[PDB]
A paper describes a structure:
Far upstream element (FUSE) binding protein 1 (FUBP1 or FBP1) is a multifunctional single-stranded DNA- (ssDNA) and RNA-binding protein, which acts as a master regulator of diverse cellular processes including transcription, mRNA stability and translation as well as RNA splicing. Central to its single-stranded nucleic acid (ssNA) interacting function of human FUBP1 is a tandem of four K homology (KH) motifs, namely KH1, KH2, KH3 and KH4, which is embedded in the middle region in between the self-regulatory and transactivation domains at the N- and C- termini, respectively. Comparison of the four structures showed that they all adopted an evolutionarily conserved eukaryotic KH-domain architecture, consisting of a three-stranded β-sheet packed on one side by three helices.
In contrast to the upper part of the binding pocket, considerable variations of the amino acid compositions within α1 and the β2-β3 connecting loop led to the remarkably distinct properties of the nucleotide binding pocket at the lower half, which is responsible for interacting with ssDNA nucleobases. For instance, a longer loop together with the presence of small hydrophobic (A194 and A197) or polar residues (T385 and T388) in α1 of KH2 and 4, respectively, resulted in relatively open binding surface with strong positively-charged electrostatic potentials. In contrast, the migration patterns of KH2 and KH4 were rather ambiguous with some slight shifts observed for nearly all nucleotides, except fragment 4 and 10 that had a high GC-rich content. Interestingly, the potential interactions of KH2 and 4 with ssDNA 5–8, which shared the presence of a triple-repeated deoxythymidine (TTT), was consistent with the previous suggestion on the preference of FUBP1 for T-enriched sequence.
Residue numbers in the entry: 375 to 454
């Protein structure tokens, strides 16, 4: 059963999740079993200083991916 978790971070922290090369987001997706989607075309009322992410998986996969992302950015994500 697949579910979704939406969160935001400041645009400047996106690197810490992606990694030099895109190695970090690939490694978190592989270890967790979840997909990690960066919003491609934000609507015009979206804050340009914030970036939306969506974790897609089973709840167990989503929880694990969220904990790995939180280690990298050094604190909790902002949930929507």
């Amino acid at each position: 059963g697949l579910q979704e978790f939406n969160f935001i971070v400041p645009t400047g922290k996106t690197g810490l999740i992606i990694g030099k090369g895109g190695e970090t987001i690939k490694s978190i997706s592989q270890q967790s079993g979840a997909r990690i989607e960066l919003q491609r075309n934000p609507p015009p009322n979206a804050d340009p200083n914030m970036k939306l992410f969506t974790i897609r998986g089973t709840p167990q996969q989503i929880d694990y991916a969220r904990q790995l992302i939180e280690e990298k950015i050094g604190g909790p994500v902002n949930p929507l």
